[model samples]
Target: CPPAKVNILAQSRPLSEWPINLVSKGVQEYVYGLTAAEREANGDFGTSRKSLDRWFARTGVPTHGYTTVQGLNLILRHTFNRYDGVIKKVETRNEKRRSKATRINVSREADGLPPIEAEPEETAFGPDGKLKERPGINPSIYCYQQVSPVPYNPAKHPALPFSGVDPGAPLPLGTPNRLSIPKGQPGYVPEWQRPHLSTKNKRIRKWYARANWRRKPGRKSVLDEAKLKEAALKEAIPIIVTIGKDWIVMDARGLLRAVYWRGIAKPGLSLKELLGFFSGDPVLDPKRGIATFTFKLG
Candidate 1:
């Protein structure tokens, strides 16, 4: 018997109508976790390729070059509220060993192997706030650190695992997988995880020791007044005007809060000049309708 033809459009309507609130909440949760991880990584923020890989493992999404916690958080919220459907579909189909589209299982197995440890060093910050040239680790020390997972004895040395790579070898894929390593083969050290032990000067060592002596001040509130004003004109005013009494009632009930507000001066332009500006505006696509909306805390 021939199979009945399924109408994809009809089937997708329910999917399209599925509540986005939960999805948005999930995205927000994911981004919040990333922010926490960024801070926990000791201000490294995972901006480097190595750290970025680890971050993707944690967050299940690329930060799109955003290095700061606040900027990344805003981008995540915008993606959730504005691009949820598309982003959700993309995440659903993502399948990569190192990809962040899916959650990872980082739980340590019962094996006696020690958990992965990082040895980060001071790096210079660029104008764009990215870290550069982090300190490398000692190969012998790192190798020893991996297996014992316990206290290290600098005096007596344990033989490197035959299943693991040579001390300075480039880290192989599916690392920390001792079972995957061949009986006589060695696993590799991840390039980014490679250690570079440099001799520190006495003065520099002293300075690093006291670098956190004083607590840093809190962040200052810096708002973008111009963009806020533009948003008010293009979006806020129209919503308020069209909804009329209902909008007013909501505002009175404190349901509509003006968390941040800014006003722009009206432009003094002749009718002809304004008409010229409108003439070049692009036509909207016929296939897709656009709607502007905002999110509320639940």
Candidate 2:
């Protein structure tokens, strides 16, 4: 018996010349759904052709006698398959990085390096801390803006530009509005603390006022207060701290409160020592001394 002979047509003709039935339903749908930009992005379709040959072999599609339509279908399938391959590679790379970070933390622990404590959540309060709600004050409007020390006026210092805003002075822009709180309120801030509030300290007062305000008697108020306190705590501040010889910046409300509360008692303590008081293992960048631990207060 002689070998079976197969007639293979030239499949290099333009796509417009191919019979409609020759193209598969999947390929038609894929091409129709793609935009013009996408179709033109990978015009060579060489990689797709190679991929389609293997696919056709595995799927039992006869590749020898196929016309240009089948060739086009294979090319489209190749494009989709290539996309899947790239996504898989990216996911694998991400997983490897995660595993590497985990190993680094574990090795640090084994070597007796202090394990850095995780940052607190936005809604977290200090020990025995609860956002107590009273009535009337809206912390959202009462809080101070996070302004730098050198006041930049567009009118007066137009030549200095916006980026030239001074960050050295971190005091509150204006006095706290006493009208936000009602008279004789238990959480009412005294006069001295209100006169010249630091950026972070002003935030503490704002949180206290807002948390203690009277809300409409309902569960909604409780939820509202939680959101308000979370917002207050996450408000950026202009506190500049130094770790070793390098300066680090932080905007966290909890750390700000810790700094203000402790600094009042011992006026001259370094920022590093204050950070140590709050976190057992304060992770810092070796070269820059910037805190590596993220504050999740948002």
Candidate 3:
């Protein structure tokens, strides 16, 4: 499979201005019936790839043309799912169908674990009636040695030393240094290991993780409780907006998560914590759909 896989990748293709990123990916996925983990888990159960390859041999057609994005999308999404083919969307259900290969699909929505399968009929042969060899794709001949697949002296092709392979450059947006670092270069900063909102940590789930250096800790509410509550009641809402540099963070449904504004000159406090804010009522509206709240500032 690896041989034929890379063979198709290396050979049997004409160059085009646009590379085969769209259709090629979909075709690769469709052709590869079983993956490494899947084969390992279903050991001796064998693969249906040869079956697919055999079908390919029978059809004897290799698509090598510039298919537009709209063409591929229409074929994959609409034609395959709607109209001619009543195929379903992507899900575990689809995977189960292939894994359960019940040649005849019997409805067991009533629930019998394994669907069922018919005994495979030996139906593989070439155009010649000799039926001498069942040829689809063999494991492969070692093509790595010569230019049949690879260049001469492939070892020297890529000579990247450990030092030059350090984490390159930071992005325009951010470069959150990973927990582990490149020892060949400067190691990760422990303080930099502080909570990142991108992670699925307890911090983002229950609290804000933004770092605001300017807002000094341990201060009473900027406004009294009664006035603050009244003010929040009037117009308390959550959102994501770019003030000057940084932006506020919130969910699409208007649930206030946290604020994210910090600057080199001076910074401001994060979330007034509207969902649980000024440390305050039924400000949650349903019929009109609102989850805003007025509470003490962070």
Candidate 4:
């Protein structure tokens, strides 16, 4: 009897004649074999040329030129998809164990006893609303500091695994550094993340010391409002201009430069007239102010 499964690459031809549908199955099997080796070693596919080069060499596929490289990339993409699916399954299993451990710890805290030893999976958060703080170790720290589990959302009270700080309590202040200056004084650095010159000169100097402080010319827009308005009428159209019998298609900005190079003065001509002179018809939908062109030049 013939084997029930057929090799995907069995019908694959040379790159010149290869169609995507014909080669996909072979690529899938190739990627599957690579992933199987990775799983056995507990490794993930990394973006290294060595692995890819090995695949290409093993398959006797030449890796030079645009078309061949594109085909190989397609195969690698399929491999990544398979690897991601495996990772997702492992994460899902771990999440379930963590959730069960959290519930068990929370129930233990309700009985009014010191929280019991946490299981290996329950090492992070217990039911008494505190993190295990180095679980399974003797002489460990617990409840050293309170932090909100849901810091971003204030509606819920702090949950286990996170130390919940009291909302109304004042934070204890530490000794200030001797070098630190007071706010609104010279040499006092503002806490803003991005450095700006608007701050005090001392602060600016402190920040600018890290940056190469050389003056650089800023870019200016070439076309002004009136030129932009004139260009807007033929915005949808390709800027096809004719010089003598030759037709060339360019962007509107380039078209303006070309007109200027031809000794046409500023406010030279309307887009319709310029295009008309170039043997192109500027077709406009008057109601919508939308325009396009049809060129007879070429």
- TM per candidate comes to 0.16, 0.21, 0.16, 0.26
| Model 2, CA-based lDDT | 0.37
Predicted candidate 2, C-alpha RMSD: 27.3
Better of 2 and 4 by TM-score: 4
Q: Model 2: which ten-residue window has the lowest total lDDT?
A: 134-143
**Poorly placed runs, candidate 4 (over 4 Å):** 1-19, 33-51, 59-67, 112-298
Candidate 3 runs further than 4 Å off: 1-47, 63-79, 82-164, 167-298
For candidate 3, give the lDDT: 0.27
lDDT of model 1 at position 259 = 18
Q: Could you give candidate 4's per-residue lDDT for residues 166-242 as a string of tens digits? A: 32332221223323777766345567733553443221123122133333466342434454334333322233322
| lDDT, candidates in the order shown | 0.27, 0.37, 0.27, 0.35
List the RMSD of every prediction in angstroms. 35.1, 27.3, 23.7, 30.6
lDDT by residue for model 3 (85-155), tens: 21123224555555455434545544655655444323222244222221122111111111111111214
TM-score ranking of the models: 4, 2, 3, 1
Question: Pairs clashing in candidate 3?
Answer: 273-277, 277-295, 277-296, 278-295, 278-296
lDDT of 2 by residue, 1-298 (tens): 1111111111233222223223333343343333324545533344455655664554443433343433344345544554444345655766666666677778787898886554332321223332222112111101011211122333543232122223343433322464456556734566667776555543335543554556667535443556654554333332332211222233333343544543432434443443334422223232232333322222
Cα lDDT, model 4, residue 235: 27
